[PDB]
From a paper:
The [name] polyprotein, composed of MA, CA, [name], NC, SP2, and P6 domains, is the sole viral component needed for the assembly and release of an immature virus particle, which is accomplished by the oligomerization of [name] into a lattice structure at the plasma membrane.
In addition, residue R82 on chain #2 of the same hexamer as chain #1 stacks onto the trifluoroethyl group of LEN, leading to a modest shift of its position. The change in the GagCA-[name] lattice is driven by the repositioning of residues to interact directly with LEN. Within an immature CA hexamer, hydrogen bonds are no longer formed between E79/R82 and Q50’/T54’/N57’ upon LEN binding (3d left). Similarly, R18 forms a new hydrogen bond across the 3-fold interface with Q63’ (LEN-bound) instead of N57’ (apo) (3d middle).
Residue numbers in the entry:
A (entry chain K), B (entry chain O), C (entry chain N), D (entry chain M), E (entry chain J): 11 to 239
The structure:
């Protein structure tokens, strides 16, 4: 077909999902970056998304449900296929799983043509709509230690989201240098500030190990009552 | 047709038209959800827009104007229509007013195919383009009583806007109780605050109907003169 | 025809109507950019004028009345058309509404030739003459709030003019930051100045909501009599 | 063709470029305005972009590289062309440079059809995408004079940007009145404010011809030391 | 081909480029994910590198020089090609520019086989090796303002690097919030910290417009001498 994706379109789509993540702007750009492409190019563009595993899982669920709807609307004709004709597509074929490049190209160049690529394109674009409406990406700045949460658990969440985040290694080191102490519970923040800027992660952790325990609660209560008295 | 509308796309279009009102980002979504849809499906999508009657009227005017332009571009050809072929569309025929689903299907799957859905799509896209460019939905946040506006007239305008506003009943009552008094000029706001928080609407109107009259002007003039005397 | 508009001429016309607006200097440029062009190209240039809707409505009225005058001068001959010959153009055909590219080209290359493009050019250029003489574009700097006008109405007028005005978005933001406060009458101007430079639009509108009311009039009268006393 | 652009699509596209400049908002609208339009109409739409010549150059570079890719994937046909069929398109033909309207219509209506318009639309979409990512239009608000920039060079840059600006003439004069003195560096701004608002441009340049010379530096240094002593 | 890449390999390679950027870990992964892959699949994997334009340019230069070497060592076949066999590959064909998928499949299935995919993989390996040794990605952490650099140029470079950065929008906003003032030179940093955290970018640029001018140098020199005296 003459409407296959060029290398520039693939790189543009990759950059689009990189900078714009899954903002609404990803919907029109995709809507123009895969017009007339056979479904395998659409699958290639769907595969080029790095990260956002949950979002693409919702996308896959949407595509599967719409393939089921497609199969519901068009019943499968239980009859022998004429040598001149070829089998009608099913929802999986529109998705591209059970259909090869040759079958898709033949479908889009039939008389009358079946616009398999465009149908899969609509399914994908409304899955993208669902992603934009519901999915919210996890950001390191959204990771703040709770009021009664242990510092080990907060550090585990911080590092899990940092690894899941898409960023450079150097900027990730800067993030774990700054936000780890920045977005911390006030009780742990007092200990972290008292430790000093040269304290390592292990030292900070054994310092906040005692927070929330009976000894720390007794100490802070004693400080409060000394301020009162 | 293989690109017929499906419940998921219709629900998604409804959700984007209610959630996003007529923000510019409604142009991509529509342009991605009606791709390949028959004009009947376009009309079905257009009917589900609740509220925004003014914008809907602008959109209908744009459709009619573009259909007139289409009819002027494509002149009517006389003579008997060939039985193998079928009669050519007009502007209203594209619009679906005088064309049934069978006629639209025949147009979209003929040789050569007349893409009635795509021309419809362009006309509708122009309609929403004008809607977003010019039309601004009336919001209860903007209903504020003018300096000389009677309190009764302001209450009537506020209630009309509330009736036209799309929102749940509970949040509508909350918006009433929190914005009818707040969004008033100081001349009425002072009286309303002096009235007390536990004031019914009838008491509100009765107390504030005296503003702007000779008595209220004389009282406020005397109060102002008290400071200078 | 050899005298169709090149892309550079179209861009030059767009720039002319952009920077020069509808100043008289637009008349000579249109007098030269479109010379010998068939009416289709003339309409194409007449379509790239963003904004100035009222001006082009006057221009359309001029063209329609000149088509009527042209029909008045040359009566329509009620007779069969010779197969070698072709129908003479009516008033609308010179404007290109009832005539396509082929008929316009044939008219412009007849024996004797009918200079349809030049006749339409004369009609259009007199339309621009009327636009230059009478039409005055709405400018933001012409938006000044009246002595006894509510601030909400002034804001509505200011923002309507801002939306209708052509400019960059950053320029529009700077203009609504400066001129909105700058172009208010003494009462609203002193209220805005007392509010402060960081006050939001809602705060300014709330403060000016009371201007012109009985309370504000009593307060300013009290201030004046205190200055007297 | 059935999907030829009507006047209102062209005018709406012109307005889109005028107001939205090259924000991402231009990508969907364009893709929704040229749906099914022949690449001749695509060139017609692209020509009406007033200003932003750098962005148009980037777009033309995109179209050239996409045409190169199209010629790369599609090999040049060899041997005599079948009289029933006609010559295969090339990248320049998709871009509309070499192909005429008749050839493009023949491609669109061929069996099987070659979607020249959609391919060219995707190429222009890629160009617009890189424009919105990278290209940043020059704005008068961003013209600020460097600490060591001579006032003459600052004025030259300011006026060049103002001439390149899309805004109207009267608002351009207003911009000259306010921003030119507002955006000067403190050394020039002190002199300009000492001159008074009545000073003309020539007087202002005369008074800021000396900022950076031995006399001015000596004078400011002496003033600072005298304030110290 | 049997060893055609699967969606998981493409996604894994994309993620490898996203996280590891261009580190020594890229060479092993690329050497194992694209094992036995058709050079068309190699090109698909190469197109997915979002950003790193300079590195990709270096890689393509390496591929071009390797193709030149391949054409140098392998002479061009002369005379007619045997119908049973097929034409020999060239350097561009190994690079995948001129070869089609069918040609590469025939090369790999030929007896004896021509391992086009492995040769292309080695060429890309050389390119990646040069990238990891020499190319260094631009990071906002490494953007700092020179001692004599005006704040406007620093801000422009900072924002250009930020736009080129691979990160999410909220993280980029956080970078703008902190690193823009953190990495300024002390002369600008003193003014920026005296401004306060509430200062906007425009206010910061206005305050720092004067550093390096005669007034600012005189003021700092006077302050230093007064501290001496
Ligand atoms: C060879 C080639 C031409 C191809 C192809 C190719 C072929 C088919 C499919 C596929 C398409 C549609 C359905 Cl409906 C199913 C299905 N239906 S089902 C009953 O649920 O199993 N299964 N498949 C797997 C099948 F068919 F192979 F079995 C599919 C894919 C999808 C494209 C896709 C990616 C995506 F992200 C979200 C989607 F909605 C669709 N990519 C995958 O599936 C692999 N994937 N999945 C997920 C997840 F689940 F998290 F969303 C993730 C990936 C990931 F990319 F790694 C990325 C991290 C995320 N690509 S090429 C050059 O591009 O590599
Ligand atoms: C069978 C079926 C599939 C169908 C169909 C169907 C068929 C035709 C039309 C129609 C279309 C185009 C023209 Cl050009 C005319 C016309 N030309 S004219 C000279 O102006 O009168 N007349 N019609 C009436 C006709 F049909 F009699 F011809 C039309 C509609 C429109 C679709 C539409 C809705 C819309 F909002 C805005 C539009 F631009 C277009 N919807 C209506 O018309 C009813 N409507 N109108 C308006 C208003 F005016 F306020 F915008 C409103 C409605 C509303 F939906 F109630 C909603 C509150 C708003 N739908 S279904 C869904 O029923 O199952
Ligand atoms: C397809 C193509 C070849 C063509 C054509 C084409 C064909 C005809 C016409 C037209 C010409 C003459 C008459 Cl006498 C009438 C008519 N007489 S009547 C009894 O009153 O209805 N009707 N028409 C509509 C018709 F013919 F379609 F029916 C016309 C136009 C005009 C050209 C024009 C533009 C203009 F600004 C002012 C004019 F005086 C004339 N443009 C429009 O009409 C659309 N327009 N109108 C107005 C308004 F009214 F506000 F001024 C506005 C537009 C706008 F551009 F959007 C812009 C905002 C302003 N273009 S192409 C490649 O160029 O796109
Ligand atoms: C007659 C008609 C049917 C037609 C046509 C017509 C035909 C072809 C082309 C064209 C198309 C594709 C390529 Cl790939 C090249 C090419 N490739 S190349 C190797 O560089 O020479 N050259 N062309 C010139 C060609 F064909 F004449 F040779 C083209 C244009 C473009 C449309 C276009 C405009 C644009 F802005 C950006 C684009 F990407 C494409 N318009 C121009 O290019 C003229 N232009 N250029 C530039 C600049 F350089 F700044 F970007 C500028 C203009 C401008 F519009 F003035 C504006 C200020 C900016 N229109 S009609 C009724 O519509 O007028
Ligand atoms: C159809 C398909 C199967 C295919 C294919 C396909 C075919 C060929 C090529 C190609 C291969 C080898 C050479 Cl030696 C040249 C050449 N030699 S030359 C004398 O320099 O012109 N030219 N080409 C362009 C050609 F072939 F079109 F002519 C090539 C590519 C490359 C793959 C590649 C990308 C890359 F980044 C670095 C590489 F080393 C190789 N992709 C491009 O080159 C496009 N690109 N370029 C650059 C730049 F240069 F800026 F770094 C950039 C891109 C980008 F990806 F956008 C990304 C931002 C960076 N892909 S599919 C489904 O995958 O799309």
């Amino acid at each position: 077909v003459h409407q296959a994706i060029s290398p520039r379109t693939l790189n543009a789509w990759v950059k689009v999902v990189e900078e714009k993540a899954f903002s609404p702007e990803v919907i029109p750009m995709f809507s123009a970056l895969s017009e007339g492409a056979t479904p395998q190019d659409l699958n290639t563009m769907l595969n080029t998304v790095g990260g956002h595993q949950a979002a693409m899982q919702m996308l896959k669920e949407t595509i599967n449900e719409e393939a089921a709807e497609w199969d519901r609307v068009h019943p499968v004709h239980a009859g022998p296929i004429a040598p001149g004709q070829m089998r009608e597509p099913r929802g999986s074929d529109i998705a591209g799983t059970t259909s090869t490049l040759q079958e898709q190209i033949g479908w889009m160049t039939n008389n009358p043509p079946i616009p398999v690529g465009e149908i899969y394109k609509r399914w994908i674009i409304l899955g993208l709509n669902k992603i934009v409406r519901m999915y919210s990406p996890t950001s390191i700045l959204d990771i703040r230690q709770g009021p009664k949460e242990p510092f080990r658990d907060y550090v585990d969440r911080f590092y899990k989201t940092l690894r899941a985040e898409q960023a450079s290694q150097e900027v990730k080191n800067w993030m774990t240098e700054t936000l780890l102490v920045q977005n911390a519970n006030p009780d742990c923040k007092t200990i972290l500030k008292a430790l000093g800027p040269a304290a390592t992660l292990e030292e900070m952790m054994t310092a906040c190990q005692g927070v929330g325990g009976p000894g720390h609660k007794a100490r802070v209560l004693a400080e409060a009552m000394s301020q009162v008295i």
